[PDB]
Symmetry: D3
Subunit: 174 residues, 6 copies
Amino acid sequence: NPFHELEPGPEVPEVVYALIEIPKGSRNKYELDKKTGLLKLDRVLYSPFFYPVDYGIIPQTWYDDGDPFDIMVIMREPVYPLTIIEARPIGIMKMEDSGDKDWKVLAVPVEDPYFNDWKDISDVPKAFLDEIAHFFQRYKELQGKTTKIEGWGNAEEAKREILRAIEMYKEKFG
Amino acid sequence: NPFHELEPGPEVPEVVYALIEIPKGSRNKYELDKKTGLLKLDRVLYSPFFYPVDYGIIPQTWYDDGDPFDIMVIMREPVYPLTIIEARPIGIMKMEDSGDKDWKVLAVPVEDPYFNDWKDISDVPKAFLDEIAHFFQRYKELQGKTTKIEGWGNAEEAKREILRAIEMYKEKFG
Amino acid sequence: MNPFHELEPGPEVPEVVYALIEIPKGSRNKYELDKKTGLLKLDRVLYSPFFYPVDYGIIPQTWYDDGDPFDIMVIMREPVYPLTIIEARPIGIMKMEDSGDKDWKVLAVPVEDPYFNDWKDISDVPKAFLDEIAHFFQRYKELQGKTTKIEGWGNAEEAKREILRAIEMYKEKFG
Amino acid sequence: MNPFHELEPGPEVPEVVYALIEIPKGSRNKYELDKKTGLLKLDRVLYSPFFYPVDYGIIPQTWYDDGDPFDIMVIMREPVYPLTIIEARPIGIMKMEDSGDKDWKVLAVPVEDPYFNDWKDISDVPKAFLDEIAHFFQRYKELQGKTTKIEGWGNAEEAKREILRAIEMYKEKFG
Amino acid sequence: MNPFHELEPGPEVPEVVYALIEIPKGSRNKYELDKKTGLLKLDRVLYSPFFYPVDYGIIPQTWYDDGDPFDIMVIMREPVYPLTIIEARPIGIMKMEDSGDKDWKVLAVPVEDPYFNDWKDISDVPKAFLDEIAHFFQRYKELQGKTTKIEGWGNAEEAKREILRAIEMYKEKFG
Amino acid sequence: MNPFHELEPGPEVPEVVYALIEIPKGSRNKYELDKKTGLLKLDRVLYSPFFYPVDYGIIPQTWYDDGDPFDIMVIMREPVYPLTIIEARPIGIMKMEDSGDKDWKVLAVPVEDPYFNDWKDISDVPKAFLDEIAHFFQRYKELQGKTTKIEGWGNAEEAKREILRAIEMYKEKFG
Ligand SMILES: [Ca+2]
Ligand SMILES: [Ca+2]
Ligand SMILES: [Ca+2]
Ligand SMILES: [Ca+2]
Ligand SMILES: [Ca+2]
Ligand SMILES: [Ca+2]
């Protein structure tokens, strides 16, 4: 299982690995099968929305909601599921999903020179942050779930949470 | 301008023409330029939603909101903008957009045998009607606009509104 | 690790099975699982300009009369990637023979797409869609000189019966 | 207006003709020119999961024995959009009958794609590719109960002669 | 009707112009407007495996020093279809010469995508993106034996200046 | 595990080899095998708007002068997914140097696509296509300031000899 075998990053927390589960533009929500590590269909979103970013997890992390720590990587061309990307955290989306702390790192790929000058949350166009928050605010509405979006934190805050999640993993597993 | 030159349908109101502006899966919202009849970008949706149906207008119609009557055609493979489809109305979505009556016909293509037994609103899976209503409920949320979804009418009601819109066009233009 | 051998046939057999997808809807490339390694392998490029009309794969830990894992076709609105696991509800079975071999294939819908919540048996599928699937398997190997015979469609109960047979066959051959 | 009537048959007929594309390679939707309106119109969704193996259209200002514009079928590496004009070199012709009507089709390559610079006649096309095109037309209307008959392929010389005949037929019937 | 002649250069020249798109981002096919009819036409297939990095088109009712309509590149997140009109804000201009011809091209953002609300001048564009556009035009005709010289980028004010020049040139040649 | 170490070089080397695909035709993303992890990893986004003109990968259990697995580049009509195995016939070899290192690449066609049945050597490939591949490799790292040198193409005989040498080098370095 790639979640357990891969390190959290080559230079934590400045550069982490993102293990992508869902490419931008997908309406299918994929997850990793915990037994086998194969990709598994979790569900088809109930609404005609698509993931606005490549979406995945940071290996060897664990979070308050009892899952690996989520990461969103802005890719110009989406990658395939189960692709590793070297990513620089630039911010963090604060949200609760049904009372669980479900925060998500926002990151850019180190190896696309397009994003060389994106280093903090203030470098992202605000319409783009709004569209991401709106997606998570409404994507489970027809399943009757409520999500609360609490805002965006900056790069420093993102990196602190990554360190916290790396420590939580070490506790729970070994 | 195709809006003025084409008849409303070969067998109104059982079979109408749909002039498609937006193929299913588009985030770009297109309209017809009224001067030239060329396709024009109206806007990019502010949220990562895609049109869940091929979306267009019925030629030579006019509606209470001061626009051609809208029609949504369920296509398995989306068509290109400015394509004419022969469509059978099977229902109607009732909604208001900023206080304007903005109802939209739901239809299936006559020439796809997949839909041969779809003749009324009750033949559509309810999750699919929900996803369409949810799209129109939220797609302008970040533009600060409010839309109210009032429910779905059946095929007979759709066909009555089509006749009304065909008459309204004749009044206003000639 | 070979997914075919390592995954259970499903979480609630035969009402819900796992489909391990090999070929997404819309592909002209026909992929298979490499027997030795479990990697995806190109079997062939179809000789005609036809595309797979459904997401196509196998049920893990099954064996059928034709000497292969039992095939399953899953109706997906948006195709998945190869090697994706889908929890699927069987709703019917296509009966066909390919060069003397019984090459029947389960038809299924995904449990986690609410669009298909009411599809529970073969009669819930538009007839034109069943015909398009059957026509595909009737003709897709015509230029390879192969003849296939479509024998018709069986219902959900029959599909479930055959899944149980295939699971038992696997146990006898490998277990 | 109607591009079918407004555009010349080609800049150097019959060596180079215009192909007015109606259906891009890969489409399961079959489009046709209103022929009175001029705008693209959905004729049908193919009943089988087959896709057009070439970019398909008509030569402007032509008329053929079947009572329609002359079908041309251009090999493109990347498909174009409907209503795009391509300068095309005829390299052959598919002889077929559809419902008894002579429904022959020109096969051509784009002048402005150097990939095909050395394709000049029907013998330059891989045989498997000619077979895939013929098989598509043999079977694409099978579920509609129509019968087509594939009679074989003619060479570039024959295709060019037929183009000139179609140009003459248009003049007699309209001009 | 020919869109190039019938549409105004824009609703609020030179702050907002119309871009009539001929080539969507991601295309290897290079399309143009047919001079006589206004239909889309394949100009060529690029000789190298490069794709247009931006949606590419022309400003209606303009004429430039190189004897063609003035070209405009629009940065779109999702590409449009050919012959689509986009209201665009010019933010810069690429200066380049193609075989002795001044072939400068306006860079613009769509007015109706809020993603670009803060892009108002050449300095707002990531440098790597400008380089990728320039590299494309530097090399895309290399195998055709053509040499192009990239002279650099001008700012929004310069782009607007040139748009006004191009509008005047059109009036003098056709009006 | 790591498919690079687990899979044989081919079922009938050097006439038929396995190509383990890392990058599908059309990708601007350059992927590489963790080579220790085994999972697909993004190496870089190409700095220019170029796309891989072929499906690109490596031959398992090979090692080459450049200190990596032997690059193979399979002509597919429909691209495959990363980590797919294709049975491939070598028809030639591209000789090139990258940063001074001998970075030669096998060119191959799939055994199971009848379209390429008559492609057996480098002379069977359209010259424009060989030029497009070479131009891609000549220029794709230009904005990274790297220099590559294209030295030309060898025939099938030469490609096969090099495959055997690479198989031997792997054995010496690992086996
Ligand atoms: Ca979480
Ligand atoms: Ca309306
Ligand atoms: Ca089977
Ligand atoms: Ca015909
Ligand atoms: Ca120019
Ligand atoms: Ca190498």
